[PDB]
């Protein structure tokens, strides 16, 4: 039980603070689990609009989304679920997500359609590099570390060369081009 | 002194 509470607090905190990027729908699902755990089964007369301080149940980016309704719906579908069970379900859900355990970096993509830069989520794992929608948290494009020919890290950007995979590179604006590059180099070094 | 491993904490 105690081990379960450590895993829970970690997964919850990583979601609430943004460390673990998730969609709006998923954020409300967790909230539901969080509510059950903190308040017990949903109660119409005790748990009514305004009861929840959205700041403690959703990631910053989702507070002003008026999703309290979605949360109470998630809380309601928990039925008479015990705290332990809800905790268990919280973690499993977090671990089942494509974004779980992925080191992310907030970068900016310069494309056509305009001259403005589109913020984007860049994730690095021990076996791949992924482009994630800054908002939807959906995976736009994913690359295999083995497809990387070379990379360039400047104090203002980072570039990836896949050589024989696709035409052109993939550059983004970031002040962590160094951090990202080192991360990749290390992972690649262990594969061989 | 002693430092406990989380792996042995109650479930």
Swiss-Prot record, chain A:
Residue stretches making up the FERM domain: 1-192
Chain intervals for the UniProt region annotation (Interaction with LAYN): 72-192
Protein localization: Cell projection, Ruffle membrane; Cytoplasm, Cytoskeleton; Cell surface; Cell junction, Focal adhesion
Subunit structure: Part of a complex composed of THSD1, PTK2/FAK1, TLN1 and VCL. Interacts with THSD1; this promotes interaction with PTK2/FAK1 and VCL. Interacts with NRAP and LAYN. Interacts with SYNM. Interacts with ITGB1; the interaction is prevented by competitive binding of ITGB1BP1. Binds with high affinity to VCL and with low affinity to integrins. Interacts with APBB1IP; this inhibits VCL binding. Interacts with PTK2/FAK1. Interacts with PIP5K1C. Interacts with F-actin. Interacts with SVEP1.
Described purpose of this protein according to its UniProt entry: High molecular weight cytoskeletal protein concentrated at regions of cell-matrix and cell-cell contacts. Involved in connections of major cytoskeletal structures to the plasma membrane. With KANK1 co-organize the assembly of cortical microtubule stabilizing complexes (CMSCs) positioned to control microtubule-actin crosstalk at focal adhesions (FAs) rims.
Domain notes: Consists of an N-terminal FERM domain linked via a short unstructured region to a large flexible C-terminal rod which contains 13 amphipathic helical bundles (R1-R13). The rod begins with a five-helix bundle (R1) followed by three four-helix bundles (R2-R4). These are followed by a series of eight five-helix bundles (R5-R7 and R9-R13) in which the N- and C-termini are positioned at opposite ends of the bundle, creating a linear chain. The four-helix bundle R8 does not disrupt the chain because it is inserted into a loop in the R7 five-helix bundle.
The protein's name: Talin-1
Source organism of the structure: Mus musculus
UniProtKB/Swiss-Prot annotation, chain B:
Subcellular location field: Cell membrane; Endomembrane system; Cytoplasm; Cell junction, Focal adhesion
Disruption phenotype annotation: According to some authors, mutants die within hours after birth and are unable to feed after birth. According to another report, mutants are embryonically lethal at organogenesis stage, and display cardiovascular and neuronal defects. PIP5K1C and PIP5K1B double mutant mice die within minutes after birth. PIP5K1C and PIP5K1A double mutant mice are embryonic lethal. Bone marrow-derived macrophages are defective in phagocytosis, attachment to IgG-opsonized particles and Fc-gamma-R clustering, and display highly polymerized actin cytoskeleton.
Phenotypic consequence of residue 4 to F: Loss of phosphorylation by CSK. Abolishes interaction with AP-2 complex. Cannot rescue the effect PIP5K1C knockdown on EGF-stimulated cell migration
Tissue-specific expression: High expression in brain. Also detected in lung, thymus, heart, testicle, kidney and embryo. Highly expressed in forebrain, in particular in cerebellum, hippocampus and cerebral cortex.
TM stretches of this protein: none
Post-translational modification: Phosphorylation on Ser-5 negatively regulates binding to TLN2 and is strongly stimulated in mitosis. Phosphorylation on Tyr-4 is necessary for targeting to focal adhesions. Phosphorylation on Ser-5 and Tyr-4 are mutually exclusive. Phosphorylated by SYK and CSK. Tyrosine phosphorylation is enhanced by PTK2 signaling. Deacetylation of these sites by SIRT1 positively regulates the exocytosis of TSH-containing granules from pituitary cells.
Source species, domain of life: Eukaryota
Residue positions, PTM Phosphotyrosine: 4
Phosphoserine modified-residue sites: 5
Free-text function comment from the UniProt entry: Catalyzes the phosphorylation of phosphatidylinositol 4-phosphate (PtdIns(4)P/PI4P) to form phosphatidylinositol 4,5-bisphosphate (PtdIns(4,5)P2/PIP2), a lipid second messenger that regulates several cellular processes such as signal transduction, vesicle trafficking, actin cytoskeleton dynamics, cell adhesion, and cell motility. PtdIns(4,5)P2 can directly act as a second messenger or can be utilized as a precursor to generate other second messengers: inositol 1,4,5-trisphosphate (IP3), diacylglycerol (DAG) or phosphatidylinositol-3,4,5-trisphosphate (PtdIns(3,4,5)P3/PIP3).
Oligomeric and partner information: Isoform 1 interacts with TLN1. Interacts with TLN2; interaction stimulates 1-phosphatidylinositol-4-phosphate 5-kinase activity. May compete with beta-integrins for the same binding site on TLN1 and TLN2. Interacts with ARF6. Interacts with AP2B1. Isoform 1 interacts with AP2M1; phosphorylation of PIP5K1C by CSK disrupts the interaction; clathrin competes with PIP5K1C. Interacts with CDH1. Interacts with CSK. Interacts with PLCG1; interaction is abolished upon EGF stimulation.
Whole-protein coverage range: 641 to 651 of 661
